Design a protein around this ligand. Structure first.
Ligand SMILES: *[C@@H]1O[C@H](CO)[C@@H](O)[C@H](O)[C@H]1NC(C)=O
Ligand SMILES: *[C@@H]1O[C@H](CO)[C@@H](O)[C@H](O)[C@H]1NC(C)=O
Ligand SMILES: *[C@@H]1O[C@H](CO)[C@@H](O)[C@H](O)[C@H]1NC(C)=O
Lengths: 49, 98
């Protein structure tokens, strides 16, 4: 796609390492820093995907 | 009639759904929000009437649920011609690498 393709995604941050051959798809925000966001995704609340 | 395996058992974590039939099995994986509505009758007592057929009311919702499985029945309801020799059904469940 001349404008690029954005349908192919990857998760970035998670709580711990992945077990061998186990999917961990989830829809929520990452707890980083000192602000456990409730979906606000503000500062220190990065989207995993 | 069956067993449930999973975590938090909601439409936010991948969940199992294992139910045993007369002679079948309907193991599946889904993200159903719940299915705990059997609708117990006001006269559900078996002393008067034991009639309880297809009392499932299951998989109310399925947002991302495609993985399904069916096979032959697991439990073989058998009778020793008396209740004293009850079928000591024994099962062992472990879930290493699928
Ligand atoms: C459960 O078993 C009955 C009879 O044993 C059968 O009619 C029915 O189709 C089975 N359930 C499913 C989902 O196939
Ligand atoms: C038992 O159930 C039947 C219908 O299932 C009902 O007609 C009857 O009144 C109940 N009680 C007795 C004592 O039979
Ligand atoms: C899952 O189901 C929801 C229901 O609205 C849908 O929006 C979504 O695209 C489906 N797929 C994923 C990967 O969430």
């Amino acid at each position: 796609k001349v404008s690029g393709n954005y349908n192919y995604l990857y998760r970035l941050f998670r709580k711990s390492k992945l077990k061998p051959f186990e999917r961990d798809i989830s829809t929520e925000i990452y707890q980083a820093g000192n602000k456990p966001c409730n979906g606000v995704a503000g500062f220190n609340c990065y989207f995993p995907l | 009639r069956g067993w449930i395996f999973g975590t938090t058992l909601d439409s936010k974590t991948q969940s199992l759904l294992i139910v045993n039939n007369a002679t079948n099995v309907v193991i599946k994986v889904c993200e159903f929000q719940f299915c705990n509505d059997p609708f117990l009758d006001v006269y559900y007592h078996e002393n008067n009437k034991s009639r309880m057929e297809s009392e499932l009311r299951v998989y109310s919702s399925a947002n991302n649920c495609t993985f399904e499985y069916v096979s032959q029945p697991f439990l073989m309801d058998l009778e020793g011609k008396q209740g004293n020799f009850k079928n000591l059904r024994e099962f062992v469940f472990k879930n290493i690498d699928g």
